[PDB]
Scaffold this active site. Structure first.
Site, PDB file in Angstrom:
ATOM      1  CB  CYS A 166       0.355   2.041  -7.666  1.00 15.24           C
ATOM      2  SG  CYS A 166      -1.447   2.118  -7.856  1.00 15.24           S
ATOM      3  CB  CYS A 175      -0.914   0.006   1.234  1.00 16.51           C
ATOM      4  SG  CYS A 175      -2.202  -1.231   1.011  1.00 16.51           S
ATOM      5  CB  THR A 176      -0.344   4.776  -0.123  1.00 18.57           C
ATOM      6  OG1 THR A 176      -1.467   4.429   0.676  1.00 18.57           O
ATOM      7  CG2 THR A 176      -0.880   4.811  -1.553  1.00 18.57           C
ATOM      8  N   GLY A 177       1.039   3.198   2.422  1.00 18.75           N
ATOM      9  CA  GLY A 177       1.707   3.035   3.698  1.00 18.75           C
ATOM     10  C   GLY A 177       1.187   1.744   4.320  1.00 18.75           C
ATOM     11  CG  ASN A 178       2.807  -2.559   6.189  1.00 19.27           C
ATOM     12  OD1 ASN A 178       3.457  -3.048   7.102  1.00 19.27           O
ATOM     13  ND2 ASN A 178       1.892  -3.296   5.575  1.00 19.27           N
ATOM     14  CB  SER A 179      -0.816   2.284   8.283  1.00 21.16           C
ATOM     15  OG  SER A 179       0.545   2.668   8.391  1.00 21.16           O
ATOM     16  CB  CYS A 180      -5.203   1.024   6.339  1.00 22.10           C
ATOM     17  SG  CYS A 180      -4.968   2.468   7.411  1.00 22.10           S
ATOM     18  NE  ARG A 181      -5.383   1.170   1.183  1.00 22.88           N
ATOM     19  CZ  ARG A 181      -4.711   1.932   0.319  1.00 22.88           C
ATOM     20  NH1 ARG A 181      -4.903   1.842  -0.988  1.00 22.88           N
ATOM     21  NH2 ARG A 181      -3.853   2.813   0.816  1.00 22.88           N
ATOM     22  CB  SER A 182      -0.779  -3.738   2.889  1.00 27.67           C
ATOM     23  OG  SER A 182      -0.362  -2.602   3.635  1.00 27.67           O
ATOM     24  CG  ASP A 209      10.143  -3.073   7.509  1.00 29.16           C
ATOM     25  OD1 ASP A 209      10.593  -1.909   7.593  1.00 29.16           O
ATOM     26  OD2 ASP A 209      10.866  -4.042   7.185  1.00 29.16           O
ATOM     27  CB  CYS A 250      -2.704   1.654  -5.118  1.00 26.94           C
ATOM     28  SG  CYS A 250      -2.202   0.706  -6.587  1.00 26.94           S
ATOM     29  CB  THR A 288       4.891  -4.009  14.439  1.00 22.17           C
ATOM     30  OG1 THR A 288       5.884  -4.984  14.728  1.00 22.17           O
ATOM     31  CG2 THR A 288       3.982  -3.936  15.669  1.00 22.17           C
ATOM     32  CG  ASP A 333      -5.857   3.635   3.624  1.00 22.36           C
ATOM     33  OD1 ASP A 333      -6.288   3.883   4.771  1.00 22.36           O
ATOM     34  OD2 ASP A 333      -4.918   2.839   3.385  1.00 22.36           O
ATOM     35  CB  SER A 363       1.491  -6.463   4.590  1.00 18.98           C
ATOM     36  OG  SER A 363       1.577  -6.248   5.983  1.00 18.98           O
TER      37      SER A 363
END
Length: 139
Positions: free
Chosen positions: A89, A10-17, A65, A82, A63, A105, A36
């Site tokens: 992406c 993802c755009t940042g490894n915080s939600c969807r992934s 990365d 994305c 957690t 997201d 992820s």
């Protein structure tokens, strides 16, 4: 080694992934080394943690990365999720099989924190559904 490996980006490894790895661990039965990452990581979203707890899964154990070579060039499949307001992406190696499962997201589901939380459980459920079909049907 004949155990698979799979990556969600993802755009940042915080939600969807993060959530997708949560579902994928369940359905893929760890016969696939699930991971992820994303263009950045600053930890996983509290609403993502709640969303997975609402289905009896944990992602607190994984957690966040950024992307790492040991998975990007080694994953049997990479998936970019994305389809959101930033839609950056994350770049992938062209040698590796890729999928594109774009949706917004849930942290960017602007309206109110309750609407964001409602979108966390929606995006969680839809991710879970497509992970089921990926494991069951190969879609």
């Amino acid at each position: 080694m004949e155990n698979k490996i799979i990556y969600f980006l993802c755009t940042g490894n915080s939600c969807r992934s993060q959530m997708a790895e949560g579902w994928a661990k369940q359905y893929l039965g760890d016969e696939w080394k699930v991971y992820s990452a994303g263009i950045e990581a600053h930890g996983l979203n509290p609403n993502a943690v709640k969303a997975m707890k609402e289905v009896g899964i944990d992602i607190s154990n994984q957690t966040s990365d950024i992307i790492d070579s040991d998975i990007l060039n080694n994953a049997d499949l990479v998936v970019t999720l994305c389809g959101d307001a930033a839609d950056k992406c994350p770049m992938t190696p062209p040698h590796v099989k890729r999928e594109h499962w774009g949706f917004d997201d849930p942290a960017r589901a602007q309206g109110t924190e309750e609407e964001k939380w409602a979108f966390f459980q929606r995006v969680r459920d839809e991710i879970g559904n497509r992970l089921k079909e990926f494991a069951e049907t190969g879609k």
